[PDB]
Amino acid sequence: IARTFFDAPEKNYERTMAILQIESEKAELRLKELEVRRLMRAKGDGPWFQYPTIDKALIDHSPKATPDN
Amino acid sequence: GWVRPDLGELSKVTKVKTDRPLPENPYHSRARPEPNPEVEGDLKPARHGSRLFFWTM
Numbered sequence: 001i002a003r004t005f006f007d008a009p010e011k012n013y014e015r016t017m018a019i020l021q022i023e024s025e026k027a028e029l030r031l032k033e034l035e036v037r038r039l040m041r042a043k044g045d046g047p048w049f050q051y052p053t054i055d056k057a058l059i060d061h062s063p064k065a066t067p068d069n
Numbered sequence: 070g071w072v073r074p075d076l077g078e079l080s081k082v083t084k085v086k087t088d089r090p091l092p093e094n095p096y097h098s099r100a101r102p103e104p105n106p107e108v109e110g111d112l113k114p115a116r117h118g119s120r121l122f123f124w125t126m
Contacts, residue, residue, distance in 0.1 A: 022117060025116070025117065026117050026120050029116060029117070029120055030120060033120075045105055046105065047105070047108060050105070
């Protein structure tokens with residue numbers, strides 16, 4: 001029965017170790033994602049939460065009719 | 070000996086040689102804020118997929 005149907009204890013042991021490593025890395029990544037999202041919401045210096053402003057390519061720099069502008 | 074200008078002569082754009090220097094800051098603008106750092110580097114695949122609950126990819 002052990003030779004035909006059952007997995008070895010060593011195989012299960014190392015499979016469990018691999019599973020634990022993968023989910024531990026995923027959990028640390030999730031916590032870092034939450035911290036990064038909170039920081040970029042708070043400060044707004046990063047690539048996320050960049051709400052649009054007015055583009056400066058629409059300004060006319062030619063001389064106008066009145067010098068005071 | 071004065072000659073009256075013709076049509077469009079007074080409306081020309083001319084050049085002026087002057088001694089006063091060009092104002093480097095006529096608008097009295099202060100220092101602009103520093104822009105955000107840009108994005109750089111190659112796009113690696115996402116680590117362990119979506120990482121959304123039980124989904125492996």
